[model samples]
Structure formats: C-alpha cells, structure tokens
Target chain A: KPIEIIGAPFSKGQPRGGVEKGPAALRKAGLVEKLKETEYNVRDHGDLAFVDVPNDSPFQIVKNPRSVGKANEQLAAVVAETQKNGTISVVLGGDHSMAIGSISGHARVHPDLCVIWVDAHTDINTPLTTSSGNLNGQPVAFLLKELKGKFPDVPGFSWVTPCISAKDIVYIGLRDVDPGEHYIIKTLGIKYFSMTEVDKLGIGKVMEETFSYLLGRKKRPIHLSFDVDGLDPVFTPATGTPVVGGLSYREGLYITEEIYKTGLLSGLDIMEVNPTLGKTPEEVTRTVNTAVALTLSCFGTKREGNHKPETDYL
Target chain B: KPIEIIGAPFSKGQPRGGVEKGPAALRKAGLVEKLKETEYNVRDHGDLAFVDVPNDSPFQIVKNPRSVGKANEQLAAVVAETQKNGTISVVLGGDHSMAIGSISGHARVHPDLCVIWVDAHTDINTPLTTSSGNLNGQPVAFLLKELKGKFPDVPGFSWVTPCISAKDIVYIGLRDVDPGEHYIIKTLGIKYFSMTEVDKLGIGKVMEETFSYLLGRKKRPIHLSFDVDGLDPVFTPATGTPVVGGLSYREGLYITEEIYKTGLLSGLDIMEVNPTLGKTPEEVTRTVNTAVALTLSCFGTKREGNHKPETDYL
Candidate 1:
C-alpha cells in the first residue's frame, strides 16, 4: 500500500525548543528510505505551516491550546485529503498532541476507530486537572470530550468531536501517570497495562490480551501513538522526560511486532524524540538507535534469537 | 588530588574522519565538569602537536608508520611533563594506538608498571603480522616489543625499550584474536582472558583471579588501557570496531571498580570512542552513557545491592 508521509512540524503543545524539528530530524535519519525498504510506496507531503500565537493570553492557562488545536485542524485536512486515495497515511510527529488532528481525521472516515497509546504517561489530563498546564498532556481528554460535544470553550477545537470513547483506547507501558490522569483512568474505566503488569504477566500475554480485546469488537482503524520515552532510559536517553524501569530493546520490539502482525496499524505517531538533549555522543547514538529499532519492529523486522546483550565496563 | 587531562589528537593509526576531534568532543561533552562533579581537581592540556608526514609515504608495506611514531613521541613528552607536576594524568584518545606514547611516558616514570589491556581485540599484531596494514592494530606489539628491546624496524619508534615483561601484562575481554597474535599468545604463554572465560567464570571471579595474579606478584604501577570497543557493541556502538558478546554494563563496571579498589592505577588510556558511527541517536546515547558509566566505575561508583535493572518502556 502507498504510504503518504505528512510532516507535522507543529510544537504548540509544550515549552520545549526544537521539538518542532522532530519531523525534520526523522527525515534526515532516513524515514522515507526506511519505509521504502519496507516496500511501502512513500510520498513526502513536506511540513505543515504553523502560525505564530501570542505567548501570553488569558486563555493560555493551558499553554498554546488554541494554537495546538489550529495545527491539528490543518493536520486533519491534510490527513483527510491524503487518505482520500485509500493510502496508509503516516504522520511523523512534532509531539504526541498532534494525534488529536491525525486521529480525528482518520476517525471522520472510520468512526469506530481504536487507539493504542504506547507511552510512559496516559496523556489523558484536562486543563482543569493538569498541574503542568501543558496541553500536550491533555490531547486524549480533548479528543474524547470532542466526541461527546463536551469539549472546553477553546478556539480551533470547535470542529472536532469526541472521536473516540474511553473504552476504545488501550494504553501500554504506562509508568508515569499523573494524579489527574490516574483518577480519569479509573473513573472512565479505560484499559491500560503498566510496566509492572508487563513484568509480572509478561509482554506476550499483555499484548495478546490487548489485541484480542481490541480486534474482537470490530475490525476498526487503529492509531498507534508511540512516544520514544516509552522505552527504558538506557534505550532512549535523549527523550524529554526519561523515567526508568520501562521496556528493554527486545520487549519494545515485541510490542511493535504484535501490532504489525494484527495488520491494523492505520496511523502512527512517533513522538518525543529530542536529539539535542543527549548528554554525550554515545547517549545520542543510543537514543537514535532506540527510535530506529522501534520503527523497524513496527514494520515487522524479525529479532534474531542468538543476539547477545552488549555490556559496558564500569 | 589534582588530575591532568591530556588530549592526544593523533589519528594516524587508521584512515577515518572525526577521530582527531575526539578530545574536543569529550571536552564539549563536559568531561571536565564531570570530573569536577566527582571532586577531582582537573586541568585540560589541549591536544598535542605532531610532525605531520606526507600522505603518500614511500613505505608501501607500513602505512603512516612515521606519522604514528612521531605522534607517540610528542605524546610521550606531554605525559612526562604532566607526571612531573604531581597530577594524575588521564589521556583522552583519538584512537587506541595513541597508547604507544601514553605507555612509553608512564613507563619512563614507573619502570615496573603492570599493564591491564581491556579490549575486544588482542591488539598484539605487529607490523609484520598485520594483514590490513593499519598502524592502529600494531600498538600493543610495538609497546610490548619496545619493552623487550626487540622493536621492529618500523619508522619513528627507536626510543622505546621493553619496559615490562609479558608476565606483567594481563589482557581481558579478548574475543576477536588475530591469527598471528593468537600464535604469539600461545607461544609466549601470556596471561589473558577471553569473553568465553568471562561468561563462564563471571566478572567477579575473573577480576579476583586477575588481581590476585597481577597484584599478588609485586606492588607495581598498573596502567589500564581501556578500549571502549572492549565492551559489547550493544553498550559501546560508537567505537571504531565492535565485536559481539562482549560484556554487560554492570559486568564491565565491576572490572574497573575492582582495579580502583587495588589503588594501583598509575596511568589510564580511554580509547577508541568514535561518536559519529553510532547507527542511531539511541546507539550514540548508549555509547556516551557507557563511557560515562565506565568512567564512574573506574572512580569507584558501586551498584547498590538494592539496585534493579529498569527499562523506560511498558
């Protein structure tokens, strides 16, 4: 199938610098070439233009909510047009919040879509519940509310509907859940499996349960939101917020491989890859390798059984 | 105690780009700051200058022999000067072969120095034995020969004498052994441990035996030649040449930590760190983290009994 590569360069979700360059970095790292290697007919749609917004506004309590919504709106249009030809639309991320646009566009075409959020955090907090005031942390909530016509009075989000129900989302590799998100997950009864659960139950069992649950209901469009921070800090030291005790290289690969096996990966959001933050050259290399490994795993790369774990001298 | 940082920006061992920039890269990565954090009084001596030889030398059999030797001579002078100031000299590398100068300079001050060669390759191939014709691969043989007064006819290496006997040298993590070097090891009966031994005996047992054998004999100045590639490719991906099934991060740390416990470290060479060759940003980060981790291990960072392996993924 043809894969339309749309670069979403929007970064209104947070205060960090250069995350807007995420798409560019991945491109430089040969995203198009890699997809071609996977035998996908790839098309580069360049980057979405982002408009400047005032840094301080009364409505900016949530930090660039209006701008984030606007970018997503533009992103939705691009996704809609690109997917009109029945091509698999792959949106390279500027941040996790870009999913609000990409998923919304896909949901418009297929209302019964499911979301598999692979990240360290749930990203399910709302403006009322968030302490950091970063809207990037609240996209999932916004998308859910939009579906039920209960979204906050925010600009640019007027066109969006609650496109996905809480039950339709599956969260994996969650070790850093916020207080608000914690309450939201329980209250909404969303399905989630933390790393602790993964450790206890095993990745194969956890993934099998997730796949069976999601695919059992309907053959729905599945959106995969993969945050680079989802892997162990040892594997991805360059991410913005690195929480330890996550998945290893093989475990992370297994999750992606399972998703590929399902053949339901309609959309992907590879987020939170920051190259500039690596403390050293080796750290930078490890971070890049983690990202590449995850992508390769998602595209069905087989893990060789005899591979040995690399060790460092203390 | 005060520590002297010597930058040997010599890359005549191999034909590759950016290795000459290693010292700058390490400094930029905050090597001084890190040392300060460890409570060491550190001074950065900028890279040493060498007499550049013509690119196309007349010697067909030995490439860059003159340049490699000249660089080592320059390095030896710097080390001698640094030792006079009562500072613990730490040599940052351009490549592993720079150790020729470091070993020579240190041997001049401490004649009975015991050498611990921690690397993946035997690095015992002499100019006569090397098939690739790279001078970097011949440093160990040169240093060993120089100590024994049996130096080969290679240009620019006349000043060195066999400073240490084969019995005083201990090699660890040798998995990729050259045929000629393997023959020499068997003939000379040099004390060495391969990855197979490490895997079977474990790092703790291996180090205990190594220390007992080397330190048990006499209280000699111990010079540690730490090639980053001595680590497994998973941990040290940014190195020049990586071999699989090397060592784990903790296992590698244990080796260095044991050496620190001996209080016999006279000179150190941290070599073969090529930051640009990492397959991905994650690989680069891992390489940098491994280097930093190894340095910390050398300075006596212990893994607490309660420490557990943590991944960032679910």
Candidate 2:
C-alpha cells in the first residue's frame, strides 16, 4: 500500500497556538522527500483547513469544545476517505489531540485495528478528571469503549463515539501521567511501559513484549500515535508539555523502526512539533528534524545507512 | 571501601584550552557532596599543580611531548599514592590524555586491573598514525603492550612503559573512530562495542558481554575511563570534539551504575569536559552537571530513586 499523508494544522486540543504549525514545520523539513528516499510511494494530501467554530465555549472545564470537536470531525472524514484506497495513513499532527480524529477515522475503516500510543502522558483523563482543561490530554478517554459511559455529553464532541476497546491499545513512554490517567490505566489493566519500565527492561525487551502482547492472539492493523514530547525534552524542546527523562533519540527511532518492521502499521500520527515554543531557532530546527527522522523510520530509513537497489559497493 | 578523589588539571592531551578547568567545574557542580550523599566516606585531594615543561617541543609530529609526558608522570605518582589506602580512586580529568598517567599509575598498585574505556573515539591512534598529533588521542596506544615498539622515541615519554595488555581492556560507546584506530582495534583483537553494536545489542546486553568477556576467567580491579564525548553531544556539548549519535545520558549512567554494582571499580577517570567550548553558559553547566551525575552513578545514584538506610517509610 502507498503512504497517504494528511497535514493536520489545527491545535485547539490544547491552549497552545504554535503547535498548529507543526505540520508545516515537518513538511518544510523534507518529510515527504525523505519518505520517497525510503522507497515509499507517498501521496501528499496537503494541510486540512480547520476553521474555529464561532462561540465555541468550555464544557465544564473542558476548553474549546466546539472548535476542537469540529476540527476532528472534519479530520475523521478525510482520514476515513484516505484509508479507503488501502494506503497507510500518515497524519502529521498539530497536537496530540489530533489523535482522536486519526485513530477514530482509522478504526472506521479497520475496526479491529490495535493502537500503539507512544507519549509522555497517557492522555486518558476524562472530562471530569482533567484539571488543565486540555482536550489533548483527554482524547484517549473519548476513544476507549470502557470509558464510554464515564464521559459527560459535550457539544463539539457529540460526533465522536467510543470506537476502540481497552484491550486493543498499549501505551509506551509514559512518565508525566496524571493521577486520574494512572487510575484509568491500572483500573482498565492496560499494558504500558512507562519510563521506569524502559529503564528496567531495555527498549529491545520492551518492544519484544509490546509486539508479543499486542499481536499474540491475532494479526490486525496498528495505529501508532507518536507525540514528540515522548522524546526527551532535549530533542523536542519545541513541543508543548515537554518532559524530562523521556525516550532518547535512538530509543524513539528504534520504536518506529521496529514497528515498521512488523508490517502492521496501517496508520501513524507524528504529533506535537510546536516550532514557536522553541527557546532558539536551532531548537525549533532540531525538533522539526527529529519529527522527520522519526517519520522516515516508519517507512524504511535505517541509522546504519541505506542503499539503492543497484549499488555495487562490494 | 572509602572513595578517594584526585584532581588532574592538565590538558596538553589535545590542542584545546579550558579543558584544564574540568576539575574545578566538577567540584563547583557539587560532585563530592553528591558522593557523600550516596553514603560513602569521601576524601578530596586538591588539584595537582602541573607545570608546562620549558621548551617542550614536538617529537616527530607529536605535539607537547614533554609537557604531556611530565604531566602524566606526576599524575601516575599521585594515583599510585592515593590507591595505597585501599580506597576507590576517582580521577577528575582535564582531558582524556591524562588517562596515560592515570591508568599507568593505577596498574602500578593493582596490576590485575582490567579497563573499561568508554568514549566516542577509540583514542588508539599510534603516534605514527595520528594526523593531528594530539597526544590525547594517542594515550591508549602508549598503554597497550601489544603496540609497545610501534611508538617512536618521543621526548619525556621514556619514563613510561606499557602496563596493560590488549585483552584486559574493552571499549564501549565508540562512534567517531579514525581509520588507523580501527585497524589497531581489529588487528589487536581488542573487544569493543561501537555505536553500531550498541544499536544492535542494546546497552544491557552490551554491558553483559563486556563483563562476561573481561571477568569471565577471574575478577579483578576495574578502571573506568569515561570521556564526556561518549555521550550524545546534546547532553555534553561543552566537551571538546563532540560527536553526533553517541550514547544517551541514561546509557552512560547505566554503564557506571552497573560497574558500581560489580564492587570491582577500583579507579575512574571523568575526562574531556571543556567549559570554554560551550556556545552558551547553559551548555557548559549542562555538561558539568552531567559529568557530576555520571560520577554519582559510579557511587550509588539510582535513576528510579535512592533511599537512606534508616528511612522510616512504610
């Protein structure tokens, strides 16, 4: 299948403004061209124009309900349409909130799809549990069937329904999780590898266990939601909600490279590359370059180096 | 055993300045206090005073032969002297060049010592193969008994003789290696794990193989020579000769923590932290802070968390 690229330039999920520019920064950093170099037939579907819903207001502490909801509704339609052609969907994210639409739309096509959510936070806080009122941190709550009745009916998100099961999703790189998110994770008995676990078992073992658990009983499409903040802040300082002691550059790359090797990655979201948050121009560039490198790894880029088919170096 | 700290503030190993200030930088970063916090009886021997040899000249393209040779001779004596009390010797380095004196002096007391040299560069270039004539990059060549006669009759180096065999040393975190250094490592059958191997085996297994190879027959004293450049430049940018794609901070710390677990660490060298090379003060501070953290790991710092023996929690 060809790789279908969808640019998500909307970030009403959080209170950050610059994250809406994440898709542009990634594209400008040659994400498309690099995917081509990796020998993928990448079809670029330019940025989705998401307009804010006028009079969008908070629903009991959940901010920007109408705007975030309307943007994702449109995103879901586009993603569902893109995957119809059997292309591997690549959503260049504005913020992690965008995962709601990408994963939901993906599930619309492949309902049996499993998700490998990689981020510093679980993003599983329901509307009632969220303190920061950031929808990005609460998207997972809206997706899992176990949390279906727990959510209060909100205006903009009325279009969203519980699409994924708790058992089909696994989380990695979690460190800055909230109390409620932690409760949900343990209560649901979701399999997760926090930074603590990553420290204990090497990433090699972590990935081995991840795949063994997710694909043990059956084979299915995999939706990879990768937040840039899942990486150490040194590599992605331009991201919102930067965490210390996150994944290293090599570890981050290893995750994607191994996922690509599994041939089950049907959808991927590279989220939260906020350029304006960078303390310096160099930092922003680093974040953007890292996002591109990560996306390339999902295709076929190797750190050791890659070669064309007809090379005669021997 | 108690931990004894020796400061070597000599940097003729490379052509860089400011590296001579590494001892002061580490001290200011509270290394001794942190070690004490780890519950070790710490003793700090003040910095050694190294005088530049008058009219020190190059010996067959090798720069500062007399100054480097004399500095190491003094360092060897101090290290030899410090180890007499049966304390673990912690050598805060000016540059990696000081490893000659540190390792040479270390072997005098503990002749059965094995070395774990961690760096981005092998630093194994013989004086003949060194294009830059930096004695810092050639120290390993001087110490390996297999390459004893390969070196030229350099000035001020007549006092030194090869003390360690090639089989007794293992290298980790190697990435930036010269052609000559590569040849020497291969021809001598030296055990090494370069960044490629690190990518393949993971640090956990790499350290396992390292210990298995070095201590498989019999256990002995271990000398850990850690160059700051062995870490990714983002973590230690203040070091001279920064390389891309080096070990992450966690991996670096893991090496030391595991060594501490072995209870065989007899001597250590924290080398090549050049504060002058940092583009900003933050960078230099980060480098110094990392150096201190790495040293603390060698004592008993745990990433998960450390507790006092008398703690009353639960």
Candidate 3:
C-alpha cells in the first residue's frame, strides 16, 4: 500500500474541545505501528499538528464556520495531493467534518467514487435546515454539487469544490438521523443501512448487498469513512456522539475487512476517536485499541476470528 | 523557590502497575508549566527511569522485597542530593512506598525533621506484622530507626539510617488503617488528626494543633508527604487506594498553602497519582490538575479564595 497519512486535529467542527486531541490519542494508541504490522511502507507523516484554529464567529448558519472551513480547506489539499499520485491516503480525523476534505480529495481524482460512510448520523443537513447547528452534521450538505444552490459559499471554503454525489455514497449503522438529514436521504434516495437492517440482515449479507448495489461486479475506487460513534458506547464510549444500539466491535471490523477485500479501496478515514471520555484506563485502552484494530483491518490485518483460506488438506 | 523534581516511577511497591505512569501523566497535564507560572526556578530532573527491578524472592516477607529496596535506594540518593543542595525535592511518586526514600532523604539533612504525612492509611506496619504484604503500607517501619532492630535489614537499605523518630511525625487523613497499622499507631502514640477531628475542629484548628505539636512557633525543617488517596474520590478517583469521606480538593490545597506559609517546608512527595483508574478525561483532569494546583500552592501560588499577604496594605 503506497499511502500518505494525514491528521486533521480540530474540535470546533462540533461544540467540543477534547476531540481536537483525537489524532494524538489514536497515534498514542499505536496506529502507526498497527499499520506497519500489515506490511505497508508506512510513509509515517508524524501528525498534522493542532494549531490555533481561527475561532472566529460563523459568518453564516454553520457553527464555528471559519474554524471548520479553514481546517478542512488545508485538509482537502493534503488528501487531494496524496490521492492524485495514486497513493492511498489515510486520514486520522479531528471530527467527521474531516470527511469534507478526505472525500473531496478522493473525488478530485476519481470523479465516479463510491463512499462507504460508517456513522450513526446521516450527516447530510444543509446550513438552512440543521437543528443542532453543529457544522459536522452538515459536511455532506456542502460537499454535494446538487445541493450547491441551497446554500452560499461557507466562509474560508472557497478552496473547496463539490466532490461527492448522493448517488455515489451509502450509509451503514445509521440510527440518530436528524429531521433535515432524514428528509435529504429520502428526497435524494441515498442508499443506507440502519441498525434495523443490521439486526434483520447480518453484517456479511448487509455488506454483500451494499457492494452489489453500489459498484456491482465492476471495481470503482472506494473511500471508506468511519466514525467510532457508529459502534455502541459499550465498545467506544470515547467518541463524540455515542448511541446505545450501534454496531458491535465484531460487526465494525467485519465491515472494515470486507471493504479491504474489495481491492478497489483507495483511501480511508477513521474519525472521532476521543481518549479523554473514558472513565477508566481500561475504557480508554478499549476505545483506542478497537479504533486502531478496525483501521488495521481496513489495511489487511486479521483479528483472532478472521478466517484464513489455507488448509492442511489443500 | 528553586525546586528539583525527582520522579520515582516504580510501582512494585504494590500489586498495581499503572502508578509508574503517574509522572508522565502529570507532566502531560502540564505540571512544569503550572509550576513555572508561579515564578519558581523549576530545574526538572526529568523522570528516574524504572529498570528491571531485581525481583528476588520474598526473602524477608515483602511482596517485592528487592524491587522496593533497590528503587528506593536509588530514589534516596536523588532526593537526598536535591534537598542537601538547598533545592526542594518535589517527588512524583510511583506509589506511597516512595515515602521511604522521600522522608528518609529529608531526615538526612534535618535529623530533627518533622513530618506531616497525609494519607488514608497509616502505612506504618512492620514487615513482621503487615497483614497486607504491600511494602507501601510499611515505609514508616524502616524509617523509624528505633524499629530498625526489629525488622531484618532490607537489602540496599544499608544506605538508609533511621532518621525520623515516632514523636516527630504526625498523621492526617487516617481511616482505612489495617488492624496491624492501628496497633502500631496506638502503641507508638503518634500525633494524628483523623476525619473525626476534621469534622469537629475544621482544617484550621487541625493544622494549628498539628503545627503546635510538631514544630511549635519556630520554622523547622519539614517534610510534607501527600498521597492523593487522602482526598475523597470525588477529587482524586485516580489513586491506588481510595477511601470515602476524605478531604475535598479545596481542603487538600488548603493544607498545602498553609504549610508553604510556614516557610519551613524543605521537601515534598505527591504520591499515588495513578492516572489509569479515572473514568473520564474529566476525572483525570480533576485528579491531576488538583495535584498540580496544590503543588503550585505549596510554593506560594494563591488560588481564588486564598488570603493575600501584607505588602502595601494597612
């Protein structure tokens, strides 16, 4: 895997401060080592360094618009340049707002990209429609070209161009969909698999149908964006927005390993890993290690239960 | 105030392990910056790296006989040199077993030393009497040279001379004493103020009586040994031994600020700061920040309600 690693460490994407430390927490959890274990060249770019994000007032509807826009603008360039060279770009996110840069960069090279967005929230609320006012919930609104007429240019977002389409993306493990997000998903007919589907159809079958629906047998370059909050707080309570009945650790890793097997997977983002939220050292270890484990699985590492094709009889 | 920080990062004093990370955890919480903000010449000696402690058999009845003796042997020299040179030796502990090195070093220069030991347990059980095999509960046993004849010579403790007398030491925050520890306290007739006294007399009267009993009105060489477990879990949940109804964060800092005002404090040990036990980053922040805050106050940095001294005032 010829890969470029980038970290966008910011928390103003939501109304939190500690999420800015997510990238550091993940690296401290041994993400670099985990990746290298899978035999990647591991062009270990240290960290994107958390700077004084210009905490200026949002000139528009988004919360802390300048900070989110400014951070993602720089993030977009780093990801785009890495992907342009046909090198896989792995982004350690500050928050889900990072997907704005991560996917936009991937889309610049492969315009017909397919996205496997793992999250609890649909994250498709436009600036005009969001109830919570968190800019992180509205990244997809700004990234889709079809929704461009709905809102004016976000402050410090002039560097960005619409890079993803509603038709190209799919959601897995959605539960806490906002009214605006639910409306957008319905109107645009975006493909999604909530916990209801995850409960009815097993993870393997859910992933199989997802692959068939999105890319069929043909291989399209894929960007897999994961937010740890998609897993239950029982596994990852250290994330920004943890819902109770989200995917199990096994389910999360199953999806990741399945994505890796696609061979067309070009880029990856493991977002919203917060270390400070855990109550015990054991809890932090569980959250950070699980996040690192899933990230490693995406790059071809196997867990204890992961099957091997070779048999002694063969 | 010139201070040299000596970190005794060893946890073999007890069964727990993560206490070794206490120094790094506090430093990660910006302890140096906190101290520097108070205008102290903080010559940080960095951490005393813990090596493979010669884990010999429990030769003379201790969980980790050689490991405890050897690490403290190293710690004694560091603290003794730091204090002898007129710099306060501020120790970030691996566990409460550090009092062996910390108080022993303080007594070397000030043979007539007075100690104000703040902890939930008396921690004075002799090797022959200790029911709970943890050496952390038995530093006072080896330090009171009078009892040096009772317990067999701990290897590597040959460098130590029993410098403290039972009459010169006082205890605060005693509640969870072992039956053995209770017997020793009563037999030795050590001056102590338990939470019962704290409730009846308040921290003011408790300190007033403690000072009068130990040092009178004169400024004497004093060693203040504080185990974060002395404070209630609400203030410091990230400690080795938590007992209920201990001092509040405000009360803990009050004792430190009052001690600093005496201008007789020569050495200090902030021990048992096990960061791994905390449930959330908020808990760790609460626990470690309070430790750093009190450490700052001990060197004359005043907090919100702190009484300002007379300069130009009437």
Candidate 4:
C-alpha cells in the first residue's frame, strides 16, 4: 500500500511543550526515508504547520481545550483526506492527543475502525473531572461520542463527531491512569489490557488475545496509536508522562510487527517522542530511534532478533 | 562478518558517572538481540561489571589512570580473544576512552590496524599535557607508542603497548581538540579531517579521501571508534564534553554503512553514548538508538532513502 507521511506537530494538548518537536526529530532520524526503503510509495505530506491560533476560550476547565481541539480539527481533515485518497497515513504525533484527529480521520474513512491504543495513561480524562487541566489527558474522552456530551463546551469540536465506538478500541499498557481515567475505563467497560494483565499474560499472549477480540473471525481497518510512554522509561524516557515497568524495546516493536503481520493496519500514530526532554544525546536518539523502529515494524520491518528470552547462552 | 557484542561499562574515565549505564540502556533497546536478526553470526559477550579500584599514588596528571587502565586491560583481553576466535567484535562502550582497550585488543590480534576515530574531540591528550585530568581525554595518546614515552607511569598499563602507528589511524570530526592535541596532529603530520573540512567537502568526499589515505585501495583491518559526542549536542546532548557543529545522524550512519560495505571492518567501538547526561528520556533514547542504528549499519543494515541537499521537493 502507498503511504503518506503526516506530521501532527502540535503539542498544545499538554503544558510541556516538546512533543511538537517529534516530527522534526524523527525526520532528522530519517523516518520516511526508511519507510521508502520498503517496497511502498512514500509520499511526504510535510507537517501541518502548527499555527498557534488565539483561544477565545469556550471551556476553562480543560487547559487549552480550544487550542487542542482546533489542532485536532485541522489534523482530522488531513487524516480523512489522506485516507479517502487511498493512501495509508503514517502519522507522526505531536502528542497522544493528536489521536483525536488520527482515529476520527481513519474511522471516518472506513467503518469498523479497530483502534489499538497503546499507552501508559488511558488519556480518558473528561473535562468535568480533569484536575490538571491538560487536554492531553482528556483526548480519549472527547474521542468517544458516548462521553462527548459529558465534556465541556469546547469550540471547533462540533464539526468533528465521534467515529470510533467504545467497543472498537483496545487499550494496552495502562499503569498510571488518572483516577478518573481508571474510573472512565471501568465505567464505560471498554475492552482494556492494563499492565497488570500484560504482566500475567506476556505481550505475545496479550497481543494474541487482543487481535482475537478486535476481530473475532473478521477483519477491520486497524489503527495503531503507539505512544512512546507505553514502553518503560528505561527504554524511552523522553515521553511527557512516563510510568515505569512498561514494555522493553523489543516487546513494543513486536506488537507493531504482529499487527503488520495481520495486514489489517491502515494507519499509524507514533506519538509523544519529546526530544527536548532528553538530558543526554543518547536519550533523544534512543527515543526517536525506537519510535522510528516501532513505526517500521507497523510497516513490516523484519524482527531484529530470532532468539527467545529463554535462550540464555554464556 | 560474524559479530561479538561486548560492553565495557566503566565510567572512571570521567566524573559525571552515568555513562556506565549505557550498556544496560543499549541492551534494553535490544542491541545484541537486533544484531542477531541480521545475517551476521551475532554473539553476546555480556557486559563487564564496572569495578572501581584504588588509584593510590597514581599520577595526578592522569587522574584515575589505574582505574581506566585496569578497565581497558580487561576489555583488551576480551577483544583480542574474541578476534583470535575469528568473530568481529562490536563493542558497546561506557566512554570514548574504551578505545584504549578496544583498539589495543584488536591491534594485538591483527596486523596493521586502521582506526577511524569519529568524535567531536580528538581525545589525543598525553598524560603530561592534559588539563582536565580525565583519562577519557587521553586514549589516543597511549595507543600510539610514539607518544608512549611522554605518558606518566600508570599502573595496569605495563601489559599494554602501542600497536598502531600514527599514520594508520585517521580522525574525523575534530573540533574541540586541546591546544596540545592541535600541536600533536600537526607535529605528527597525521591525516585528519575537522568539522570545518567536513562542511567544505561533505561527509561523502571526506570519507573518499580518508579511505584512500588509509589504504590506497588495499584492504586492511579497520576499527571504527564512534563517540556519541561526535554528533552536535543538538543530536546527542547526553554525551560528556559535547561540541557544536558535528555530523547529522544519517551522515554518521553513512560512514558506518560505507565501511560495512568495505567488508574489511574487523572491529567497531560505539563509544561515549552517555545515557546519564540526558536531561530528559528522549535524549537518552535518541543517543542510544543512534548508536545501535549506526552499529547495525556497520553490520550491513539496508539503506533508507536517497535525496541529497539539492533534492528538495518542497
């Protein structure tokens, strides 16, 4: 399938302002160029310029709710247009909040959009309950139409109605969910596999079960939303909200590889790679490379290793 | 070529003690595992523990000489043995100073060692001339026996001797060299290319001349000692003593890839990827990932894309 590279370089979703730099950093690391290496038509849809629009706020409870919504609003048009144009969009994220646009875009283009929301935080905080005021924490809430009515009146969002139903998305790597996010997940009964479940059932088994649940004897357009925070901070420490005890470098890459093997993946959002957070040169390099590698896995880069964890040789 | 991944996890060469964490960080990023995926016969030698020994009466001119020397002493044995066993060694370093061991180890086992020192700093300070007193700044001085008489009496170095001539090793990306290093490079008439020349000639042309100067088309054993600090701090902020204006991620990877194509690379030392110096998580990830990616490029990872500075489609 031909691929269109979209850079959603907007980070107003959160107070920490580095995630927007992800697209540039990944480009410097040669993201699309590498994607072009695989037999595919690589279209470079340069980043949507993050024109900071003044927020004549409609909601004060959610920090920059208007700004975040507007950014996603623009992103939604890009995503949908790219998908409708018959190109699989490989979206490099500005933040996990960009998912609002990515999922909406893909869901609109094709029905039965199955989402794999891999993140440390469920990001399901609704405006009514969010204490931090960061909309990055609440994208998941605005994304679901069921919870959309509960959100505050944020302008620029009405144009984009929810496309993904609660049942279509699967959550993985939830450890530091906000109390409200946890409450939302439980109350809404969204099919989720938290870190606890991942620990009990290894990533391989977990992903196997996840694939089965997402497509029980059927196939749908799969969207992979990989937040760098899903992996342990030890592997990727440059993310905005880091929760420890996440996936190892290979473990995370394996998930993408598995998804690509199914051949149902139509779009990907590699988000939350904030290079500015890096203290040393290697931290930024590691995060960006992991992001690129995992993205490659989604597009089907061969696994880097053949040995199992049990194959310990001296 | 078959590869052996060895980690020298010592940080006694410098004070900001976090570089020793590089091996663990790189492994978690799947260094050894990833190499296994390539067709090369990848072997994991594991990491040598960072052991600290007392440096009583050590030459103050070479602070921690005993410690650095001892660490290199062990690394030297492993590299030599690994080579004697016929597998090319790909060493993951704790510091750029590990070159003292990695180069010496390879030189002991192979004849006519040609070194490619890629770093922002020349690291050619003899014990008698160094101002910082950091042994990490003095590996190249000890490796060239011509300067051996100038070095102070340090413990654990009696077993070590220079095995490569000054003319055999070429330095690239030398911008932050000490006054003494500047004097020595001119005095020895060693072939080198500074960032100034890299800017003027481009990395491709620079390597063309460098390879010609090293062998004149005759293939010989080569060792690539890549320091993360060789990249501009913007790319690798985690490295100690980072300098401005260095190679881009792809530029450095190209050097590695070109060498891998030569099929004469016997050993590679991806040194000075200091994870501890990272200010945020992504910095560490970026640096480590670049290190691993370049290493893979050395072992012949496929190229990504082709578009020179002149090929702007925007």
Q: What is the DockQ of each candidate?
A: 0.03, 0.06, 0.01, 0.01
- List of clashing residue pairs for candidate 3: A278-B279, A279-B278, A279-B279, A279-B280, A280-B279
Error (Å) of candidate 4 at residue A87 is: 24
Identify the runs in model 4 with alpha carbons over 4 angstroms from their true place: A1-314, B305-314
| CA error at residue A73 for candidate 4, angstroms | 27
Model 4 chain A worst lDDT run, 10 consecutive residues: A302-311
In the range A108-159, model 2's lDDT, one tens digit per residue, is 9999999998899999999999998899898898898999878788777788
Please tell me which predicted candidate would have the highest TM-score against the true structure. 2
Q: Estimate the overall C-alpha local distance difference test score of candidate 3.
A: 0.79
Query: How far does residue A102 in candidate 4 sit from its true spot (Å)?
Result: 22
lDDT of 4 by residue, B136-214 (tens): 8888888886786875667767777888878898988988988998999898888888999887876778778889988
Candidate with best DockQ: 2
Tens-digit lDDT track for model 3 on B129-191? Answer: 877678889888888856778877765567777888788888898879888778777887888
Tens-place lDDT per residue, model 1, B227-269, is 8888878788887788645777778888888887787766788
Candidate 4 Cα lDDT to native? 0.80
Ranking by TM-score: 2, 1, 4, 3
Please identify model 2 stretches exceeding 4 Å from their true place: A57-63, A127-133, A149-161, A175-183, A195-204, A232-235, A242-254, A280-286, A300-314, B1-117, B121-171, B174-205, B214-228, B239-276, B280-314
Chain B of model 3: TM-score? 0.93
Estimate how well candidate 1 is docked, as a DockQ score: 0.03
* Model 1 ranges off by over 4 Å: A54-56, A145-151, A305-314, B1-314
The estimated TM-scores of all candidates read 0.53, 0.63, 0.50, 0.52
